[PDB]
Amino acid sequence: QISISSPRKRIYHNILETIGGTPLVELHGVTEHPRIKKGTRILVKLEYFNPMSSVKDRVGFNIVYQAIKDGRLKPGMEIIESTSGNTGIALCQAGAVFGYRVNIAMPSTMSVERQMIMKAFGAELILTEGKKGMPGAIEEVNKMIKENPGKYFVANQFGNPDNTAAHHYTANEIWEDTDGEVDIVVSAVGTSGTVIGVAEKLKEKKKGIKIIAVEPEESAVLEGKAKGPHGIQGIGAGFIPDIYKKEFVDEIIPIKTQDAWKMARAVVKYDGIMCGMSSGAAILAGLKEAEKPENEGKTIVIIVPSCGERYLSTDLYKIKDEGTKIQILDSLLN
Amino acid sequence: EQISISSPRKRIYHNILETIGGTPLVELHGVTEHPRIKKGTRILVKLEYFNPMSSVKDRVGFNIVYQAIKDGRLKPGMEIIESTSGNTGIALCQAGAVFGYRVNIAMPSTMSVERQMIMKAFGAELILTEGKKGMPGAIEEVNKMIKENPGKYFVANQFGNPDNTAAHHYTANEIWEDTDGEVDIVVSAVGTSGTVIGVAEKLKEKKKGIKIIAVEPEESAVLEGKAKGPHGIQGIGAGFIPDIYKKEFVDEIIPIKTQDAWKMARAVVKYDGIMCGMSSGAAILAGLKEAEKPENEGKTIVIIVPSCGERYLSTDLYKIKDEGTKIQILDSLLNEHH
Ligand SMILES: *Cc1c(COP(=O)(O)O)cnc(C)c1O
Ligand SMILES: *Cc1c(COP(=O)(O)O)cnc(C)c1O
């Protein structure tokens, strides 16, 4: 028997109130492996259920809403951030609701898709020199702040603890949804707001929970390697964010870009869940935990930051995989 | 005011299909700020893009496949087929993936390449038909395939399948529960008509006096008895009256111009921060038109929002950049006289 969702029994005052309370869903297709025991539970928390389909919805909202409550953002000021991704979308959504102008700086070469999304929300785009990358976008933001003191609130996603703090809700949802049974949480790391915010709130609930960060093998900076070229969009920032707190992270798992994409392909094919690239990374790390003998019967929760639809212009679904399901899962796990 | 985000669901879903439905009902504020709309009337949008694949059709793909499995119309060995280049294709692929059935989707080779990619990701077999022939070419090929392979295929038949309409009794129950029975008017832009009919069937059981409004393109006003015509409101205006349409359940039909549907959608995202799709712009505009009627003062108006704007980035939806303040834009959208 299969029951769909019941009424929410709420009228939301605006779209920001629909942020969070994201669903926790059992994996079955990709967990069908002789070495993963029946009792081991592998669950994915689908952050693309947020109104703009990513985990960053929580971040854009909390950063802006807190700044407004704080007086760090007040009438006549504008929001600014250098970002070409989900954070920019999330800031645009918050700014639209609150009635604050949003300025997003990114290299002109970037996501013309996400550019259009940001413009649709009424953002002013600051398109910087393509060859200078994100450093060039940050550079222009700093120049604008210098020339206009008092005008701008900078979101500062990698240094702002309102990022981290938003994920106390993420943690509370994992705790409640699992009835306190969660044993391990796996999170692919971009800003690190999720892994740290979740870790600190869950540790408050149960010290024994294992917290696993995931990063690209090609840019394993949390593990002390250097910034390198990789293809896992949304993670591998190439530095350790100021909001990172190593004390709260129990293990770091490196995942190859190609394996993350291949995992994401298997998850949509065998579970009907259209996860993004970083989710492929997290889920593979989670499956690797799930086959460990010391983890038999444990409840493993894996954060899924975004949906595959935001990746159609990428190479994510371009490579075809050879073999049967078990062949594909063996190739990922070996 | 205090802004509070959503509480935990307090559920572990056995699979992705269990996350379908129970979509949020959200107040509009920004686009309702016009002198002709009274403070007391409540204008709400039901955001069907909260479904796992971001459209109302998740309910339809699911219920069509599930009810067919339960009935025995779909059984092991058979494959699912449908000619569709829209959201129904995606919803069938999602259902097929979870239930473990092959899904065959037919569409013109030139139509929605992005959602072609989405469907293939889900493991669907794409039947790409001659571009110039359009959807009739796709329907023709599905017809050929089922004729040659009797018993092999289960046809979803979205425009004639009572399981489409039936799925919307849940949509109706959600509207009913979320409004504490206060809902007065439901506005739905019509594609298959599953939503407007299924909602009407169930709500008309709850209380007398709930006004059911269908919305269609001004250019293809076939429900109002006008002739089929070219229009740009993706997801609606099929050009015919679907077999599941029941005119007795519909109180009024509102035609909306393509250009106005787009402009409304642009306004909703900019002033309410809600990224609704094209057909949503049509439904919302119709809803605001209801909200300005004096007989509707203080009523609760519920507008179906079938899809999100991100599915429209390759269209002209956001290419036109409206000049003018919020009040000029809203005033220009409501200014038609009748
Ligand atoms: C932000 C993001 C992440 C990482 O989440 P953090 O909380 O920033 O570490 C992973 N994937 C995608 C697609 C993201 O946008
Ligand atoms: C299906 C659909 C509609 C219309 O809903 P019906 O229940 O088929 O009438 C409107 N917009 C979009 C984008 C759709 O996919």
Q: What is the CATH number of the domain that holds B36?
A: 3.40.50.1100
Rounded CA-CA distance B127/B79 in Å is 13
Question: CA quadruple A160, A162, A164, A170: dihedral positive or negative?
Answer: negative
Query: Measured between beta carbons, which residues in chain A are less than 8 angstroms from residue B273?
Result: 14-16, 92-97, 121
User: Which residue reads 């309702």 in tokens?
Assistant: B32
Helix (H) or strand (E) holding B59: helix B57-71
Find out whether A103 is annotated in a ligand binding site: no
- The domain in which residue A268 lies consists of 1-55+157-334
The token pair at B102 is 């092959």
- Residues B278 and B140 both lie in one domain: no
Experimental method used, please? X-ray
User: Rounded to the nearest 5°, which phi and psi values hold at A103?
Assistant: -115, 115
Helix (H) or strand (E) holding B97: helix B87-99
Beta strands A24-26; B42-47: pairing state? unpaired
| A123 close to A26: Cβ distance less than 8 angstroms | no
Which residue among A55, A59, A249 has the greatest number of ligand 1 atoms within 8 angstroms of its CB, and so is best to mutate? Answer: A55
What is the maximum span of chain A, computed from C-alpha positions, in angstroms? 63
Q: Is A216 exposed, middle or buried (0-12, 13-18, 19+ CB in 10 A)?
A: buried
Rounded CA-CA distance A25/B16 in Å is 7
Secondary structure, 3-state, chain A: CCCCCCCCCCEECCHHHHCCCCCEEECCCCCCCCCCCCCCEEEEEEHHHCCCCECHHHHHHHHHHHHHHHCCCCCCCEEEEECCCHHHHHHHHHHHHHCCCEEEEEECCCCHHHHHHHHHCCCEEEEECHHHHHHHHHHHHHHHHHHCCCCEEECCCCCCHHHHHHHHHHHHHHHHHCCCCCCEEEEECCCCHHHHHHHHHHHHHCCCCEEEEEEEHHHCCCCCCCCCCCCCCCCCCCCCCCCCCHHHCCEEEEECHHHHHHHHHHHHHHHCCCECHHHHHHHHHHHHHHCCHHHCCCEEEEEECEEHHHHCCCCCCCCCCCCCHHHHHHHHHC
Rounded CA-CA distance B270/B292 in Å is 21
| B311 close to A113: Cβ distance less than 8 angstroms | no
| A4 close to B18: Cβ distance less than 8 angstroms | yes
| A234 close to A188: Cβ distance less than 8 angstroms | yes
Report how many domains make up chain B: 2
Beta strands B300-305; B252-256: pairing state? unpaired
Domain boundary (B134, B157, B180) is at B157
Rounded CA-CA distance B308/B94 in Å is 18
Nearest-neighbour CA in chain A from B134: distance (Å): 24
- Residues B254 and B267 both lie in one domain: yes
- Residues B61 and B120 both lie in one domain: yes
Q: Is A56 considered catalytic here? A: yes
| B262 close to B317: Cβ distance less than 8 angstroms | yes
Q: Please list every residue in chain A followed by a chain break, i.e. its C lies more than 2.5 Å from the next written N.
A: none
Look up residue A130 and give its amino acid.
Answer: G
Helix (H) or strand (E) holding B89: helix B87-99
| B64 close to B163: Cβ distance less than 8 angstroms | yes
DSSP B218: G
Helix (H) or strand (E) holding B121: helix B113-121
Question: CA quadruple B97, B100, B106, B109: dihedral positive or negative?
Answer: positive
- Residues B196 and B327 both lie in one domain: yes
Look up residue B117 and give its amino acid.
Answer: M
Would you tell me which residues 175-204 of chain B have a C-beta closer than 8 angstroms to some C-beta of chain A? 176-179
Q: Where does residue B291 fall: left (phi above 0), alpha (psi -120 to 50 degrees), or beta otherwise? A: alpha
The token pair at A76 is 């006549």
Q: How many CB pairs under 8 A join A and B?
A: 216
Q: Where does residue B334 fall: left (phi above 0), alpha (psi -120 to 50 degrees), or beta otherwise? A: alpha
| A63 close to A323: Cβ distance less than 8 angstroms | no
CA proximity to B330, closest of B35, B26, B39: B35
DSSP B33: -
| A207 close to A183: Cβ distance less than 8 angstroms | no
Helix (H) or strand (E) holding B88: helix B87-99
Strand order of the β-sheet with B25-27 is A11-12, B25-27, B42-47, B300-305, B183-189, B211-217, B252-256
3-state secondary structure of B301: strand
- Residues B81 and B189 both lie in one domain: no
Helix (H) or strand (E) holding B44: strand B42-47
- Residues B132 and B47 both lie in one domain: no
| A216 close to A257: Cβ distance less than 8 angstroms | yes
Strands (E), B49-143: 79-83, 103-108, 125-129
Would you tell me which residues 303-332 of chain B have a C-beta closer than 8 angstroms to some C-beta of chain A? 308-311, 313, 318, 321
For chain B, the straight-line distance linking the first and the last C-alpha, in angstroms and rounded, comes to 38
User: Rounded to the nearest 5°, which phi and psi values hold at A46?
Assistant: -90, 90
Query: A18 CA to middle of ligand 2, Å?
Result: 22
Rounded CA-CA distance A93/A155 in Å is 13
**Helix A112-120 vs helix A86-98: crossing angle, to nearest 10:** 10
User: Which residue reads 């490579």 in tokens?
Assistant: A319
The token pair at B282 is 């049509």
Rounded CA-CA distance B183/B200 in Å is 12
Encode burial over B94-109: b for 16+ CB neighbours within 10 A, e otherwise.
bbbbbbebebbbbbbb
Å resolution of this model?
1.9
**Does the Cβ of A164 fall within 6 Å of ligand 1?**
no
User: Rounded to the nearest 5°, which phi and psi values hold at B210?
Assistant: -85, 120
- Residues A326 and A273 both lie in one domain: yes
- Residues A178 and A281 both lie in one domain: yes
CA distances from A278 to A13, A253, A290, A307, B229 (A): 32, 13, 18, 10, 44
- Residues B152 and B164 both lie in one domain: no
Rounded CA-CA distance A73/A160 in Å is 14
Domain boundary (A123, A156, A189) is at A156
- How long, in residues, is chain B? 338
- How many Cα neighbours within 13 Å face the side chain of A252? 20
- Residues B252 and B304 both lie in one domain: yes
Rounded CA-CA distance A10/A12 in Å is 6
Distance of CA B95 to the CA centre of its chain: 18
CB contact under 8 A, A16 and B22: no
The token pair at A168 is 């106390």
Rounded CA-CA distance B306/A162 in Å is 33
- Residues B4 and B81 both lie in one domain: no
Ordered alpha helix ranges (H), B157-291: 162-178, 194-206, 258-272, 278-291
Domain boundary (A156, A173, A203) is at A156
**Helix A193-205 vs helix A161-177: crossing angle, to nearest 10:** 50
- Residues A174 and A315 both lie in one domain: yes
DSSP B8: P
CA proximity to B104, closest of B114, B89, B86, B115: B89
3-state secondary structure of B283: helix
* Long-range CB contacts for residues A280-284, cutoff 8 Å, separation at least 24: A280/A232, A280/A255, A281/A188, A281/A214, A281/A216, A281/A232, A281/A235, A281/A255, A282/A186, A282/A187, A282/A188, A282/A214, A283/A27, A283/A30, A283/A44, A283/A186, A284/A255, A284/A259, A284/A260, A284/A332
Give which of B4, B5, B323 to mutate to test A binding, by max A Cβ within 10 Å: B5
Q: Is A277 exposed, middle or buried (0-12, 13-18, 19+ CB in 10 A)?
A: buried
CA proximity to B6, closest of B22, B20, B28, B29: B22
| B95 close to B74: Cβ distance less than 8 angstroms | no
The token pair at B252 is 């009024």
Contacts of B139 (CB under 8 A, 6+ apart): B83, B106
For residue A193, give the ligand 1 atom closest to its CA.
7
**A66 interfacial to chain B (CB closer than 8 Å):** no
Contacts of A117 (CB under 8 A, 6+ apart): A89, A92, B275, B309, B310, B313
- How long, in residues, is chain A? 334
CA geometry: angle at B199 spanning B195 and B200, to 5°? 115
CB atoms within 10 A of CB A205: 13
Rounded CA-CA distance A271/A274 in Å is 9
